[PDB]
């Protein structure tokens, strides 16, 4: 849906910012790499960075229980 998705994906199509994006956590024996990865049109890089950082900040606080519950179900399904 246009706005029927995770908040970042809903923003990905409200002004047609992203063409695709993904999140990753590449763990190593002693370290790792959290972060995100996305493709951009030439004139939309700034907006995607702004939205992405906003979501990370919004997760560092203002974390509703319902959103966490959805994440846990996704993790269970994906893991199995």
């Amino acid at each position: 849906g246009v706005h029927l998705s995770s908040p970042l994906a809903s923003g990905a199509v409200a002004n047609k910012l992203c063409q695709s994006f993904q999140t990753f956590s590449i763990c190593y024996a002693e370290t790792g790499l959290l972060g995100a990865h996305f493709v951009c049109d030439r004139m939309k890089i700034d907006d995607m960075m702004f939205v992405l950082q906003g979501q990370w900040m919004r997760l560092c606080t203002s974390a509703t229980e319902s959103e966490v519950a959805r994440g846990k179900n996704i993790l269970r399904n994906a893991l199995v």
């Binding site: 030439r42 004139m43 890089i45 700034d46």
Partner: protein, 81 residues
């Protein structure tokens, strides 16, 4: 032409930078900074300084000549008698 999105068309260039928190704010400010300033000063010393020296010479002479004029004239009183 006025937006960062579209200003020029470049290709085949790479850049490397470090975070502000990962480096010193005054790196080699004793062994590499001072000599660079000395290079800057020396490279443009003769292009500026000498002209302003002429100004100083013109300024000193002027003042000297001005005061020299107010001195009384012994040649205007020798015959006055």
């Amino acid at each position: 032409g006025r937006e960062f999105g579209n200003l020029t068309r470049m290709r085949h260039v790479i850049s490397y930078s470090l975070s502000p928190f990962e480096q010193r704010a005054y790196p080699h400010v004793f062994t590499k900074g001072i000599p660079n300033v000395l290079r800057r000063i020396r490279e443009s010393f003769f292009r500026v300084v000498p002209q302003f020296v002429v100004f100083y010479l013109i300024y000193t002479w002027g003042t000297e000549e001005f005061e020299r004029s107010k001195r009384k004239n012994p040649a205007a009183y020798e015959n006055d008698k």
